[PDB]
Design a protein around this ligand. Sequence first.
Ligand code: 2H1
Length: 342
Amino acid sequence: GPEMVRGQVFDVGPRYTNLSYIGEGAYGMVCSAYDNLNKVRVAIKKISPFEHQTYCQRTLREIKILLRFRHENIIGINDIIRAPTIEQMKDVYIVADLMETDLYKLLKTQHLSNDHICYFLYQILRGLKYIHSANVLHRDLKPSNLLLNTTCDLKILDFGLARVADPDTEYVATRWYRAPEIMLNSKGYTKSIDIWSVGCILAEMLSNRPIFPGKHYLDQLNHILGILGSPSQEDLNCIINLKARNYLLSLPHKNKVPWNRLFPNADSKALDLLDKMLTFNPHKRIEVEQALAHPYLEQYYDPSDEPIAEAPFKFDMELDDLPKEKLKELIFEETARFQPGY
Ligand SMILES: Cc1cc(-c2nn(C(C)C)c3ncnc(N)c23)cc2ccc(OCc3ccccc3)nc12
């Protein structure tokens, strides 16, 4: 029979053995396992989406994007296991490189020196540069979506909320990393929403504490304005939405808090870059290639070793809202090339 982990079956043998609980991912339980073919311990995520439309849809979408993307700072799929007939397939197991932890857990437990911060930040933007080059917005960068290994290699996870970057909410664990414009007008304008999310992660690395921990929807904007200050007139004039602009004008005045008051031990170049990432106005916010070229990342900056996508990625939006059972069939087809062959 199959091995079991906290009452959950992991029918991944004979190739993968000696399973052990790591944690809960956003889509299912994650265990570590020994790969008997490559002689190495790997991470295996178990996914059970076929009891709902939204899970099947997001599963199919994630498998397609991670299979097309190939970059060292973005999580890759090494293998996929499922039953040989669609009628048996009640679960899907995705296999990936074993890392040590996520940035969420690391920051709850330990200090990061400037070199670790600097190197982690470089890798987030390196990976993000590839994603944005494919015309994709992540829209949910946060510490829990960043995996680290023991040699400080960093990988980005979770394109569940990813979209094309052209002009066009639900439940999420945290709004602490959402850019202000997302709640002030068009639903996540541009690539600057991700740069905002990365700035928030930088701040959190400097202090081990999230910078904008809103306790509810409107509170999130109060946290942001309480540090950045009230928007200037120029910045106010970039808020296109009538109600948003009015709402901003109705709020109490707040003065800017200097960065070196919040982060008194931080490298002044780090705070300079942070200032440019956490700019209220998304049109003035620093872009990924410019951020990589900031003096703070001079040690690692190397545009010959910062690859871009071969082409733009396209999401087939019509597959969304297809019937539960049809999505099950497409996931069977997409996972077929990992089934023992030839
Ligand atoms: C997002 C994600 C995280 C982890 C993971 N999560 N964790 C911890 C944070 C629980 C890890 N620790 C060490 N190594 C790891 N690989 C992990 C394993 C994963 C293993 C497979 C995987 O497949 C991506 C995927 C494919 C299809 C649908 C949804 C997700 N995604 C994983």
